[PDB]
Ligand binder design. Sequence first.
Ligand code: HEM
Length: 397
Amino acid sequence: TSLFTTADHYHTPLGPDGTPHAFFEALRDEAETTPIGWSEAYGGHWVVAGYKEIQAVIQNTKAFSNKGVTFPRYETGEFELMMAGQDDPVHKKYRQLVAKPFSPEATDLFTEQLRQSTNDLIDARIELGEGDAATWLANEIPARLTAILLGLPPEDGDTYRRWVWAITHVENPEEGAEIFAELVAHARTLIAERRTNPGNDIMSRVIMSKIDGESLSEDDLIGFFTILLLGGIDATARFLSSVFWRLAWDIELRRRLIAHPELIPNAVDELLRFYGPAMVGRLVTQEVTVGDITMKPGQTAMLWFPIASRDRSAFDSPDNIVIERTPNRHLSLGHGIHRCLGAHLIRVEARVAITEFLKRIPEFSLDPNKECEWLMGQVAGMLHVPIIFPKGKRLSE
Ligand code: HEM
């Protein structure tokens, strides 16, 4: 039988370590024979697993549209996902609006603020000898930075996370769509505020932008607010969560990063290749053949980046975290026109989070009396990472 037949990104079998990795490795093995397979989940769709097959699809925008970027579609009411859910020429026009603020140069001005914030966060529990690395640190670092970027209150991470939960999971329609509406209500308030009292944040910038000389509609602005809050907060928190979990038990990886801080940027890349949370969809717009498979219009193809990132044709020793790996052309941040807008930013956030955490708490391990939990979906990673460590001292407060 085939692992593709029941492949489902929201229901990936977990191995004894609590991750979907044993399954990903088995699927990677089958993909060497069958790089694309049909899954009966979600009414029938294609699962693209080979690295070259994903390349092939992602590069063919004529036949594979981003109208199917999320599948099943994320709950955003009547709003489309800004940039992510569009094809050119529309997609390019909107992305040029936010390209500067997201340029490495524009985000790098937050680097030291990130370091300080990460250290202030660690201070909150270093004296306690225990904490859930995901909720205490991984969820907070990107949520607080994203907040500041969008001109939102850094302290309300919990309300933002609830909106994301609704958008990506919450199985009850009414629920998910009603909570997404709460995000919309808040966006509208924020937009009206910035309209009169502009700031230096990204929302203020797009609010004052124009396409074809005309100002953006409130719907377009809510669209930007949404995709940026989701991007900045979801995958980033699940990726950092998975990295803290890995460093909690992998004493070998951990000691090397402490001994060779200079290898951290490279390691972050390798860790992005191994724990990349994302899987993305494409809507088929015309008959197209990729490998042995011919897809039909209206069908959906899911790009299983985690499998391709383990393709022996593209990576030597794919199942090992080789921190000195270079070049590392993983597909965790996409490729082509939809590349992740937040690529440099997640790299800096991880670099900073890892560096300061290991500097502050070099010794720690998973809590033997509390459970870890892995969230599945289009953005997958550890949701809870209870750890313990010797009690330490705050830097401030
Ligand atoms: C671990 C962190 C992250 C991962 C693994 C990730 C992954 C991705 C992937 C796979 C794409 C391309 C989707 C496609 O091919 O259609 C993408 C798109 C996008 N990401 Fe990220 N992302 C992450 C963090 C971020 C951050 C920090 C932001 C917040 C600004 C962000 C903003 C976006 C945007 C706006 C797009 C749409 C790009 C376009 O369609 O042109 N991402 N991301």
